[PDB]
Amino acid sequence: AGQIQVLEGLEAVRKRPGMYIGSTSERGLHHLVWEIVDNSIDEALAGYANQIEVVIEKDNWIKVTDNGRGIPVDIQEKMGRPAVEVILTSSVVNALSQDLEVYVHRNETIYHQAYKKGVPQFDLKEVGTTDKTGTVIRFKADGEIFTETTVYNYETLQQRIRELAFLNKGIQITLRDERDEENVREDSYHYE
Numbered sequence: 001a002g003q004i005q006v007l008e009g010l011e012a013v014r015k016r017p018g019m020y021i022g023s024t025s026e027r028g029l030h031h032l033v034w035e036i037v038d039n040s041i042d043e044a045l046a047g048y049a050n051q052i053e054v055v056i057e058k059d060n061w062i063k064v065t066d067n068g069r070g071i072p073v074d075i076q077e078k079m080g081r082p083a084v085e086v087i088l089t090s091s092v093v094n095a096l097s098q099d100l101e102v103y104v105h106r107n108e109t110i111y112h113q114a115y116k117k118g119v120p121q122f123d124l125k126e127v128g129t130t131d132k133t134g135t136v137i138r139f140k141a142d143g144e145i146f147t148e149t150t151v152y153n154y155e156t157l158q159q160r161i162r163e164l165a166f167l168n169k170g171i172q173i174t175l176r177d178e179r180d181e182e183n184v185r186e187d188s189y190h191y192e
């Protein structure tokens with residue numbers, strides 16, 4: 001019933017992307033990071049996280065990690081599906097990513113799910129145990145949407161990360177570039 005409406009939401013994001021993210025240029029590419037990063041910042045603001053890490057990985061994957069409570073995994077009654085799937089199958093980032101995955105550390109458990117263009121590739125799966133909580137999202141921007149470039153700009157990321165850390169004092173926000181294995185760069189910001 002409500003799975004029909006999830007599907008149509010994805011078709012709608014993918015047909016008119018600029019209506020959701022501003023554009024499909026370099027600016028909109030970087031806007032995907034901001035959308036993920038802002039959820040981590042809200043978690044810190046609610047009192048539950050103090051560390052966010054943004055990694056530019058090989059092939060221009062992005063990984064965003066925080067140490068908050070973990071996206072919830074409980075079964076929504078009205079979908080029959082785990083909360084984390086419901087939130088992610090209505091995410092613009094996910095819809096505009098050729099691939100994306102999520103790891104959630106919560107309830108001493110590591111849960112995992114993957115998607116392509118917003119569509120789950122399998123049911124949320126328990127994959128491990130943990131004594132931490134938090135959320136990891138890694139995603140690969142869709143080249144079919146972002147036709148100008150899918151290459152991130154370290155200084156573009158760094159300037160905005162430094163400004164977010166300055167504006168949201170008490171959060172440690174760390175940027176790392178790992179695209180070049182032989183020269184890894186990292187800048188780490190933590191005001192008060």
Ligand SMILES: CCNC(=O)Nc1nc(CO)c(-c2ccc[nH]2)s1
Nearest residue numbers: 039040043064065069070071135137
């Ligand atoms: C890597 C990006 N991080 C991230 O999304 N963190 C988040 N944590 C929580 C736990 O409250 C989130 C939440 C979504 C709906 C309810 N809770 S969303």
